[PDB]
Amino acid sequence: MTTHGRATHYSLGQGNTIANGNCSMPAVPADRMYVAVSSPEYSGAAACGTFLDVTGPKGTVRVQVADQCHGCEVGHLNLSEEAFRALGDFNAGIIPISYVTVRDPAGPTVAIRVKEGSSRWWAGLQVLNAGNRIDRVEIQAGRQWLPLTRTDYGYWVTPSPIQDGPLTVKVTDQYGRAVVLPGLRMAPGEIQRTASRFYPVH
Numbered sequence: 001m002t003t004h005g006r007a008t009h010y011s012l013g014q015g016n017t018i019a020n021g022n023c024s025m026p027a028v029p030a031d032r033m034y035v036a037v038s039s040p041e042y043s044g045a046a047a048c049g050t051f052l053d054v055t056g057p058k059g060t061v062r063v064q065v066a067d068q069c070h071g072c073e074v075g076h077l078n079l080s081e082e083a084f085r086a087l088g089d090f091n092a093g094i095i096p097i098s099y100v101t102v103r104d105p106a107g108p109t110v111a112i113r114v115k116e117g118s119s120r121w122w123a124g125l126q127v128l129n130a131g132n133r134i135d136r137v138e139i140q141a142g143r144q145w146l147p148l149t150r151t152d153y154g155y156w157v158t159p160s161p162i163q164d165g166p167l168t169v170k171v172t173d174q175y176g177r178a179v180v181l182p183g184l185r186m187a188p189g190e191i192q193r194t195a196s197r198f199y200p201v202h
Contacts (some may be wrong), residue, residue: 004098005075007056009084010036012066018116018189021067023048024126024154026113026191029064032082036067038074038125046133047101048154054079054099056087062102104199105131110179112169112192115155120186124155125169128191131198133174140168173198 012020015028021036023045028034035054045066054061054077056062059081061101069078077097081090088095107129117122125148127134137156138145141163148156179196 001202002098003075005077005096006096007077007079007084007087007097008072008093009052009081009090010078011081019153022153023066025064026126026128027065028066032080033061033086034061034080035063035083036069036072036078037065037074038076039068039070040074041070045150045152045154049127049130050133051102051105051131052077052099053102054097056095056097057089061086061159062105071126079088101133103132106201107131108193108195110171110181110196110198112181112184114184114186114190114192114196115157115190116188118186118188120164122158123162123186124151124157126155127171130171130173134171135174136170136172136178138170138172140170145170160178 012028017027020028035052041047050065052063054063072078084090110130111128113126118124125137127137137148139162146162148158150156163170169181169184170178172178175196179198181194181196184192
């Protein structure tokens with residue numbers, strides 16, 4: 001539903017090329033529209049990879065949930081400086097806002113990043129461009145599916161070894177929609193683009 005609250009501002013700067021924010025984004029978004037959310041709204045990183053449409057005095061801006069604001073009460077967003085300025089007066093420090101989690105935000109096809117230190121014995125995966133909350137990430141083991149566990153820093157990790165050769169990953173969103181991503185490589189650090197979408201381009 002709609003949340004009513006307020007915003008402060010902060011910055012990750014240009015950031016780095018490995019992990020940005022508690023959500024470990026591969027990069028600070030090019031448009032610099034991102035946000036840190038309260039611990040309850042962070043929901044153990046379930047909010048990672050999701051977007052908020054935040055309405056303020058001067059308009060509505062779309063921000064990627066990138067980070068956790070431990071000191072933020074529910075309803076209190078810590079907006080990027082760019083998002084803050086798009087909404088109100090920077091020098092005001094705190095502005096009134098309302099926001100919603102975006103349903104099926106426009107974006108590219110799903111991509112997967114294998115975490116540094118991964119191997120067949122134990123691996124982490126980050127799912128990019130799912131658009132909405134992800135509830136399941138699984139790797140194919142023959143006929144079965146091996147369920148990964150959600151970490152609090154934006155990845156999913158394996159509970160036991162996976163087969164050698166290409167990985168087939170199945171991702172299921174909060175709505176029960178699933179994409180199946182075959183031919184993935186055990187290649188730490190690489191952003192592997194796929195041909196899949198949870199929803200078509202509209």
